[PDB]
Amino acid sequence: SSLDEIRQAQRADGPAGILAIGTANPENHVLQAEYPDYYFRITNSEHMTDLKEKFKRMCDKSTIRKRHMHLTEEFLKENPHMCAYMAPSLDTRQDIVVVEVPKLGKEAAVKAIKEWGQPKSKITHVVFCTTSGVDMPGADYQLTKLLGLRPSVKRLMMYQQGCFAGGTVLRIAKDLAENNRGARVLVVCSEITAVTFRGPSDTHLDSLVGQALFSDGAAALIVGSDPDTSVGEKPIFEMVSAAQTILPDSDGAIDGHLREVGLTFHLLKDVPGLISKNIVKSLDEAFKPLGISDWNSLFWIAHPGGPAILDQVEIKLGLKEEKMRATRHVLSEYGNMSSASVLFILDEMRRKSAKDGVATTGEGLEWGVLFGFGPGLTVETVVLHSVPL
Amino acid sequence: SSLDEIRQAQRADGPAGILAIGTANPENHVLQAEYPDYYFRITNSEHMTDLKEKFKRMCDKSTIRKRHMHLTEEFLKENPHMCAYMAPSLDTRQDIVVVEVPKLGKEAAVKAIKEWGQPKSKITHVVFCTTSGVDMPGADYQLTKLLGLRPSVKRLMMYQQGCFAGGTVLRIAKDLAENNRGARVLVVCSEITAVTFRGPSDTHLDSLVGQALFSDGAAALIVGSDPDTSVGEKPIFEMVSAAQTILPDSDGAIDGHLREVGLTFHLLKDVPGLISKNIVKSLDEAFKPLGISDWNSLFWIAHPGGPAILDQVEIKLGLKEEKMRATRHVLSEYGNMSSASVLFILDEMRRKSAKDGVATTGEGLEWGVLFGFGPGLTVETVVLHSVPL
């Protein structure tokens, strides 16, 4: 009767858990070892000898083996305004991603829902995250329609977020799941690089870095509190806390603008240096309340923005070489899929732990940390607890 | 200690309340009665005599008196590509709104924070919503910087949302405030129509509807659970539940696309008819649990998309003429400010209630409803409880 009684009946009891994970990528892919030749050919830039050498080194140093790409050679031959460094092309780019982003997200979601094993009518919330295009209604609406979810799902559409948003969606889903009894949140991150792909310019080498790193993929979760074992629900990871911060002295480090030529990125500061200089402050804030100071006692998920970020974090913190294994595996096999990447890494970690027969889903350890890194410079920090295997 | 003990200590106890409201608009404004003459003059379209007559009737039927507009005549004279119907112009529009949206949002937020009366360091979360431009980092980052909030504020950037998102930000803020002990959420909705302004055409009259209705404004809230009366916190309204649904048979009713010509809107179905035919189902779902069936016993906030929505809802439900007073006042004095509009209406209602000396902030009544309407067709339904005066 009272507002207080309503509130206590309305909310969930326990911590939010990741109950399922599914992933998907465009079938089409490129092998990084061959990408400099392909990219300089399809962008009609083979005369740019010195710049191609620089790009070969960038691709060789990336540690990426394979990247999935919706964009094909045959399509790009018909679309020279997308192959240019800077030609008016946003309309064509949008036409691609407003369709392909929710379609790829649906492929991941179907896999997540199958693992979860519950009827899709039990989904109560949808969180959709992309940095690839914008539209109204959003990709969240399109996904709801493609999956045939109930019309009364509570949706949140996160557009143009950037590379930290794999942490953001976990932070969002946590509050949605924990504050609503029975809530089951479908989280989807889906990224298609058709809005950022562009040709090379020897006066914009930061733009070239993105052409070596960014790739396509989608990941889907089911998140909920109070799992029901009797119907087959089983958490994989439990969320304990989620934080966000802006790093000091980082203004303008990474900017991204949506313009008539599509999405462009600009780097003005040493991003690996900024992240590694400050990450310990986020670890202390997250884990001092829990009594944890040994960062090698954690299982680790870090957004693989590029190899230098991972290398410099590992050195600064004294992490054992094994801590970044799952993260580096995803970077190697898939590249930087923006917001989806850390969700691929969670999947890789729990699958390897199960295959190996270790004691928990987090490599046999109890506590873990997940980091998103992106424009701001923004750092998202999620504390995770593993589940016994 | 245990994860359950962490969870219960981490979360808030009571329902989320709106603790302060502030609003702002560009000083520049147009009188609707004069707008057909102005619009057809400044777009060099005075030869379109029949179309101007149609637009005059649209403006006269809108019931809008005044609309605030950042875009000035002087600016448009210097930027004739924004006065064409479909000239490339996104870059100019983005240049305007990536700056002016957070600036207007700051103006509203300063007022909300001053009313709230607490130190800005007590803000823990920021929810920024706009349909006017996108950028990375987002307007949420820019607002944090402009106000000097703590760098560790937890931000959520809601881009390209559309007219229902005044309800969405309340739904988001409710879960953030209720699930996090001590959380104080700064919510800002800020809309600048420089992205949608364009010249007239007889190949696209639904764009003309938008040119008659849309206007600029920002609104800011402080939202929190467990108000601290010892420092002067007092809720204005309390949130009880928040729902979202997609109306049946409404596919493609309202679409909006961000293109090289800016943001374009496309209308296909009878929006007032769809809303008025289905709104009772949202009322029943929200209020059957509370034993409430008399919609005239509620105080009302409805998104003023246009006057026909309000008129047809009033007729279909049998509302007394007085129920839509606050909503229609904001429509008349400010126009359709997209997501900010319902927040202006909350402010109008609680200010008029206090001025008139009635018993509660909701026109003397106990229970109320707030609706957002927008692309989908999406209906956001928030149940509110007033506070005694």
Side-chain angles (χ1 to χ4, degrees):
Chain A
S1 326
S2 73
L3 296 193
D4 182 74
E5 286 161 357
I6 291 168
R7 182 81 276 277
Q8 307 323 314
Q10 188 184 76
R11 70 201 311 163
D13 294 322
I18 298 175
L19 303 176
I21 304 167
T23 67
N25 310 81
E27 288 191 17
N28 184 65
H29 65 273
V30 297
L31 294 177
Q32 190 79 322
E34 294 164 71
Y35 197 68
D37 286 342
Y38 170 70
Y39 175 78
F40 272 78
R41 180 172 56 82
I42 196 67
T43 64
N44 287 336
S45 304
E46 282 175 321
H47 59 286
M48 300 181 188
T49 301
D50 288 338
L51 190 66
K52 185 178 174 182
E53 297 169 11
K54 290 187 189 299
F55 188 65
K56 278 183 192 302
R57 275 182 286 230
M58 293 174 180
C59 288
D60 291 350
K61 284 184 69 174
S62 69
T63 74
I64 299 172
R65 186 183 72 86
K66 160 168 74 61
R67 291 189 275 165
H68 297 258
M69 312 283 211
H70 179 80
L71 291 176
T72 64
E73 175 170 355
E74 289 172 350
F75 181 89
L76 289 170
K77 281 168 163 33
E78 292 172 359
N79 286 277
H81 58 325
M82 286 177 62
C83 292
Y85 169 58
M86 302 269 283
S89 48
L90 177 70
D91 294 345
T92 304
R93 299 167 183 275
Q94 286 273 70
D95 287 348
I96 301 160
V97 294
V98 301
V99 173
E100 297 303 330
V101 165
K103 175 171 186 300
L104 186 70
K106 179 215 181 173
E107 299 182 14
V110 168
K111 293 173 191 180
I113 292 163
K114 178 179 180 189
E115 175 186 5
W116 181 39
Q118 309 313 307
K120 61 191 176 63
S121 67
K122 291 283 183 169
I123 294 167
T124 59
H125 297 69
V126 174
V127 177
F128 202 113
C129 172
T130 186
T131 312
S132 305
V134 304
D135 199 38
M136 276 183 299
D140 61 310
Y141 167 85
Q142 300 301 348
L143 179 67
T144 298
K145 183 182 167 184
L146 286 175
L147 287 171
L149 308 181
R150 284 183 303 107
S152 291
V153 289
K154 291 163 191 73
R155 298 171 280 123
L156 290 181
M157 180 67 245
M158 312 304 297
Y159 272 131
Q160 206 70 43
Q161 309 274 299
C163 275
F164 60 79
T168 312
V169 294
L170 287 175
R171 177 163 53 87
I172 295 165
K174 179 183 182 301
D175 284 343
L176 289 187
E178 287 170 358
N179 201 46
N180 296 278
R181 191 177 302 280
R184 294 288 181 266
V185 185
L186 173 67
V187 176
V188 175
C189 293
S190 183
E191 304 285 7
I192 293 179
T193 57
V195 66
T196 52
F197 176 86
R198 71 184 62 261
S201 157
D202 62 10
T203 49
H204 299 91
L205 290 167
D206 48 352
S207 182
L208 214 50
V209 157
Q211 305 301 319
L213 298 176
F214 289 134
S215 67
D216 301 0
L221 322 167
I222 302 290
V223 175
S225 296
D226 310 328
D228 183 350
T229 298
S230 76
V231 306
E233 294 184 319
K234 350 142 52 189
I236 305 163
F237 297 103
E238 296 191 302
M239 282 188 277
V240 182
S241 71
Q244 193 194 49
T245 199
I246 297 155
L247 299 185
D249 306 316
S250 69
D251 295 42
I254 314 159
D255 288 355
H257 311 304
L258 187 67
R259 316 287 285 177
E260 292 168 38
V261 298
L263 181 60
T264 67
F265 283 100
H266 318 267
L267 296 173
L268 286 174
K269 293 175 176 175
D270 177 7
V271 164
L274 281 164
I275 291 169
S276 63
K277 178 181 185 164
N278 292 286
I279 192 166
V280 68
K281 188 174 184 160
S282 287
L283 287 162
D284 287 335
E285 179 166 309
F287 286 102
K288 187 143 178 53
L290 298 170
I292 300 172
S293 55
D294 175 4
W295 315 133
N296 280 308
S297 71
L298 304 175
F299 60 95
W300 273 76
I301 298 93
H303 172 66
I309 294 170
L310 305 181
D311 288 349
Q312 289 178 38
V313 164
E314 172 179 271
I315 286 157
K316 175 74 174 205
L317 297 184
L319 302 187
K320 299 170 179 299
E321 293 63 40
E322 293 69 32
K323 308 311 298 192
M324 290 286 187
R325 184 216 65 81
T327 295
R328 286 177 171 137
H329 176 78
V330 169
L331 176 61
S332 181
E333 288 299 305
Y334 300 103
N336 177 350
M337 301 172 283
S338 184
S339 64
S341 306
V342 289
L343 306 187
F344 276 73
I345 295 164
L346 284 172
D347 200 24
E348 162 67 19
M349 178 178 293
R350 64 91 177 228
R351 286 181 177 265
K352 186 73 183 321
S353 304
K355 272 187 199 66
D356 287 352
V358 293
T360 79
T361 55
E363 310 182 332
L365 305 177
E366 296 285 299
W367 300 94
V369 65
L370 178 152
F371 284 107
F373 311 124
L377 207 164
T378 296
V379 176
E380 302 258 357
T381 308
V382 178
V383 174
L384 299 173
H385 200 284
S386 64
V387 177
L389 289 176
Chain B
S1 248
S2 68
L3 294 193
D4 272 298
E5 294 169 333
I6 295 171
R7 183 81 276 276
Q8 303 322 317
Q10 186 179 78
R11 74 203 308 167
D13 292 320
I18 296 172
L19 302 173
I21 309 171
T23 65
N25 313 82
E27 276 202 14
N28 184 67
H29 66 275
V30 295
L31 295 180
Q32 189 74 327
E34 323 180 338
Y35 195 70
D37 292 318
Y38 170 67
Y39 173 74
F40 274 79
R41 181 171 63 250
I42 194 69
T43 63
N44 200 23
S45 301
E46 305 248 81
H47 62 284
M48 301 181 184
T49 298
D50 288 352
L51 192 64
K52 183 178 176 189
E53 275 162 22
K54 283 185 188 304
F55 186 65
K56 171 115 155 53
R57 283 195 291 274
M58 290 173 185
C59 286
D60 289 352
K61 292 190 79 167
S62 70
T63 81
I64 297 167
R65 187 182 72 83
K66 163 164 69 66
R67 288 193 278 165
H68 295 258
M69 309 287 213
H70 177 76
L71 277 181
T72 64
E73 180 170 358
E74 286 204 354
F75 184 89
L76 288 174
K77 279 168 156 52
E78 304 158 351
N79 292 274
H81 59 300
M82 268 176 76
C83 294
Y85 168 51
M86 291 284 171
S89 55
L90 178 69
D91 287 347
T92 300
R93 301 168 185 273
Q94 283 278 70
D95 287 344
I96 295 164
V97 297
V98 301
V99 169
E100 299 297 332
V101 164
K103 185 175 174 302
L104 191 63
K106 181 217 177 181
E107 293 182 30
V110 168
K111 296 178 198 183
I113 290 166
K114 189 170 173 209
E115 174 190 7
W116 179 42
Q118 311 309 310
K120 59 190 173 61
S121 55
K122 296 292 191 171
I123 292 161
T124 59
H125 294 72
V126 175
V127 179
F128 202 114
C129 172
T130 188
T131 313
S132 313
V134 305
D135 200 33
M136 315 170 80
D140 62 313
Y141 168 87
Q142 302 297 349
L143 180 69
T144 295
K145 188 173 175 187
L146 285 170
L147 291 166
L149 306 183
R150 288 184 300 103
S152 292
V153 289
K154 294 161 177 78
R155 295 171 286 124
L156 291 178
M157 178 67 244
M158 312 302 299
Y159 271 129
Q160 209 61 229
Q161 304 279 299
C163 295
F164 61 76
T168 312
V169 293
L170 290 172
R171 176 164 53 90
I172 293 165
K174 178 186 187 297
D175 286 344
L176 298 184
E178 290 170 351
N179 199 48
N180 295 280
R181 194 173 300 281
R184 292 289 179 268
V185 185
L186 172 72
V187 176
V188 175
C189 296
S190 180
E191 307 283 7
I192 296 193
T193 58
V195 295
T196 55
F197 177 85
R198 70 188 64 260
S201 167
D202 65 15
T203 50
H204 294 86
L205 279 85
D206 51 16
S207 169
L208 215 58
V209 167
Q211 308 299 322
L213 295 172
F214 291 135
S215 62
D216 299 0
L221 321 169
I222 300 290
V223 173
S225 293
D226 307 334
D228 182 357
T229 60
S230 74
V231 300
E233 290 189 325
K234 191 176 205 305
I236 306 163
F237 298 101
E238 295 181 303
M239 282 187 275
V240 182
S241 68
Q244 190 193 50
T245 198
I246 296 161
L247 299 190
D249 305 319
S250 72
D251 313 67
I254 306 161
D255 291 347
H257 310 303
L258 190 63
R259 315 287 288 170
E260 291 165 48
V261 297
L263 177 63
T264 64
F265 277 103
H266 311 258
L267 287 181
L268 268 187
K269 292 171 176 173
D270 179 6
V271 164
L274 283 163
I275 295 164
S276 55
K277 168 185 182 176
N278 292 285
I279 194 163
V280 61
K281 189 167 181 180
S282 286
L283 289 165
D284 283 346
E285 183 173 279
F287 284 103
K288 194 140 167 50
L290 305 170
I292 295 167
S293 51
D294 178 2
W295 315 133
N296 278 308
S297 77
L298 300 175
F299 58 96
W300 273 76
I301 300 95
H303 173 66
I309 296 168
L310 306 178
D311 294 347
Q312 291 178 219
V313 165
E314 177 181 311
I315 289 157
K316 174 77 180 189
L317 300 179
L319 304 182
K320 301 169 181 302
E321 292 71 13
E322 297 84 359
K323 305 313 297 191
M324 291 290 182
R325 185 214 67 86
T327 293
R328 290 175 165 140
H329 182 73
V330 167
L331 177 59
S332 296
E333 289 300 298
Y334 298 104
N336 177 353
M337 298 173 289
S338 182
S339 64
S341 307
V342 290
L343 306 188
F344 274 75
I345 296 167
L346 286 170
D347 200 28
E348 166 63 23
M349 178 179 295
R350 63 101 176 215
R351 283 174 177 272
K352 182 78 187 331
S353 297
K355 183 166 91 185
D356 287 350
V358 298
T360 78
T361 52
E363 304 183 331
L365 306 172
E366 295 294 290
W367 297 95
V369 64
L370 176 149
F371 287 105
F373 311 126
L377 211 165
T378 296
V379 175
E380 297 262 355
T381 307
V382 180
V383 176
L384 301 166
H385 201 289
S386 66
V387 174
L389 289 176

